[PDB]
């Protein structure tokens, strides 16, 4: 019982971490485009 509940919690944490991950990727690419504009 506990094993499965813990796995479900780990899945929810996975979901949150992925959300944060591609959010950070978006921020990265935004700053990167800004970097290229500043280089230009």
């Amino acid at each position: 019982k506990g094993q499965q509940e813990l796995n479900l919690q780990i899945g929810t944490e996975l979901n949150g971490v992925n959300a944060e991950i591609r959010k950070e990727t978006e921020i990265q690419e935004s700053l990167e485009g800004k970097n290229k504009k500043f280089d230009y």
Binding site: N7, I10, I21, I27, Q28
Partner: peptide, 29 residues
Amino acid sequence: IKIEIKSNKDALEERKRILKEAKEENKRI
């Protein structure tokens, strides 16, 4: 059950590290 729990935990850790590294890189940019 057990092994899937451990695998999910581990992968979650590595993706958290990826998140933290992306945060470092965004800050540095």
